[PDB]
């Protein structure tokens, strides 16, 4: 009758990318959506869940605090195995390279349930880092029946592995589309109103620090929004449009990233991007750079003093990251992924194009 | 210099007949520390073999299967193979095969950052869920590796074609036949073979009725030819061996045969009739031609090699087929003269100079296995 689909949470940054998923799971009659969340503590996903309005239908306690990898491991294949013994979903989504995201690809494969890995295939080469990143995201691939890859990169990388094309889909970032339900306008924030309509610079080794202040200082229409470097950070900043507020949470983020003028950062270099905000990296290695979504910074305070001015000034440079189309999302990811699902186990004829 | 502390980790019986000929090579370099680790949750089942070899292992981890589900075992084996890597940090780690203790032993490593030498590495089938779950154990633990040994150039193939760097593979032939070194006995004894004497002497190893009858047939038209037979008594069998073997006081059925045990009676045997894949990569290495039981050969090498024969289920061809190896010498010769394409016994030689090199206690590189 209906295809019996399961997505599996657990840390909050997959709570977002996965929400637009569980999502369009809904608009299809044939599908029939669980959502099980495999997370310690609740109390991090309600937010996103709600945003969403997300009601789990499963909910494992895995404990992953003062634990070791095999530990938490094994809880978390324990408890999953358990779950799978009684629901017993057709296909098993699971999303990155958490090690809970190894953890029930490999509890669903004991039980023959078959597994689709969304934001599939990305490779450091390296198998130490990040660790145990890669390799969860190695092993889950090995288990994985079908590959929703971000990115073309990412399906070479699958390719590589000698895995069947046939298999592998470019369905570009599911982030993007969580922006189209996390992004509001009538956003209230009182940190937001001391900017009023001032050009504001969403911030995240003291040169930088050194570097915007004097930003700060020299453009008077301009304000910093920012959340050892608690304390080096707030010497540096006594200043009245350099707000040193608390860390923001993703959907504060995002909304932070919406009403920014441009953004500097040391992850966001994916959301924002679609939302036309420049992003000016810190760092020499980047592992949008040649999209024209993200520009390179460095450590120097004439660098970044440099670049941070050319887009304060330069109307055209600054035009250039504000119109960049995003490489990673056109924000219907989820979307070709169900309709993916739909084509993969004969419910629709037709194909999805993949994301280009 | 600073020696290397290496670990061998193994808990089944056709495990430790593949790992204790490399744990005997690792004992004859001072270059290396090596410890053995059994995971056997009942340590009687490898007793046979460990004194076979004279292995006294440092560790002995019993872990628990028996009416198990994969997720516990999986989870039992880490959670045992963690608390030991914990508390002995050895170098490299080295683990064999397929069995889900292989991998969960790989990925305990892997989260201490201890390096693994995956033995038998490479062996594929398409197959997600065949065998379920070996096949996709040698995949995890091939994902964890860092050095490859593979039994042969296809393994070595199969490796490079899922992008695993050509620099970390070594084509080593089977340990298996490395076995073969140390398990037959010159002075090996046992009741049958009393009452088969001087008698060429055919193995058998498994339409079984059609099997019978071309036995019956041989044993008849050859008076100086026994058969052995290990089987686990059964009722279809032990109806089926008093039709056709009846009364024929030269074929002999007997107790299912132990590794060391089936060594020993396949370097006395004439010739072997099996459809085991065993029996088929390390009989040749003793030089006893070998009659496959089967129309579709699971190793093809071995065909080419002119050391295994298909001989299919019907009766008749089995006959023949039989009959030749006996009467022909030239084809005899032929057979039992092959190059068997699995190994040469210097396996587990070639591993070990493999992880001398890598360490840089060697500047040199062993021979790759041609065979």
């Known amino acids: 009758k209906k295809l019996k689909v399961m997505t599996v949470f657990g840390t909050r940054p997959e709570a977002i990318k996965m929400a637009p998923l569980v999502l369009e799971l809904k608009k299809y009659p044939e599908i029939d959506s669980y959502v099980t969340v495999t997370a310690q503590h609740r109390q991090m996903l309600d937010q996103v869940l709600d945003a969403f309005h997300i009601k789990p239908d499963f ?14 491991t094994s809880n978390a294949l324990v408890r999953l195995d358990e779950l799978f013994k009684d629901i017993k979903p057709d296909i098993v989504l699971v999303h990155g390279d958490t090690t ?7 509890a669903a494969f ?15 080469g ?10 969860n995201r190695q092993m889950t691939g090995a288990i994985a029946d079908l590959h929703f890859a971000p990115t073309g990169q990412a ?11 046939d298999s592998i889909f470019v369905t570009g970032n599911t982030a993007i589309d969580a922006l189209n339900t996390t992004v509001r306008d009538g956003y209230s924030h009182p940190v937001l109103d001391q900017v009023g309509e001032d050009k504001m610079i969403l911030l995240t080794m003291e040169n930088m620090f050194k570097a915007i202040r004097r ?4 453009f008077e229409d301009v304000q910093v929004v920012y959340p ?13 449009r350099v707000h040193l507020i608390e860390p923001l949470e993703v959907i504060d983020f995002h909304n932070f990233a919406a009403k920014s003028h441009f953004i500097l950062t040391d992850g966001v270099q994916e959301e924002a991007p679609s939302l036309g905000k420049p992003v000016l990296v810190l760092r020499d290695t980047t592992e949008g750079v040649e999209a024209g979504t993200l520009k390179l910074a460095g450590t120097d305070e004439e660098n970044i003093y440099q670049l941070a001015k050319q887009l304060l000034t330069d109307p055209d440079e600054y035009k250039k990251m504000s119109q960049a189309s995003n490489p990673y999302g056109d924000g219907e990811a989820s979307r070709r992924i169900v309709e993916e699902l739909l084509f993969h186990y004969g419910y629709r004829k037709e194909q999805p194009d993949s994301f280009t």
């Open 228 to 240: 050892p470097v608690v304390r080096e950070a707030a010497h540096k900043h006594d200043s009245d």
């Open 110 to 124: 004991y039980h023959q349930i078959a597994v689709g890995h969304v934001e599939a295939g990305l490779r450091t």
């Open 155 to 165: 399906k070479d990388n699958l390719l590589k592995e000698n895995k069947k094309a």
């Open 100 to 106: 809970t995201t190894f953890a029930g690809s490999l």
């Open 126 to 135: 390296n198998k130490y880092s990040p660790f145990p990143e890669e390799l």
């Open 59 to 72: 909910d494992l306690n895995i404990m992953k605090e003062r634990q070791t990898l095999a530990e938490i």
């Open 215 to 218: 930003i700060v200082g020299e």
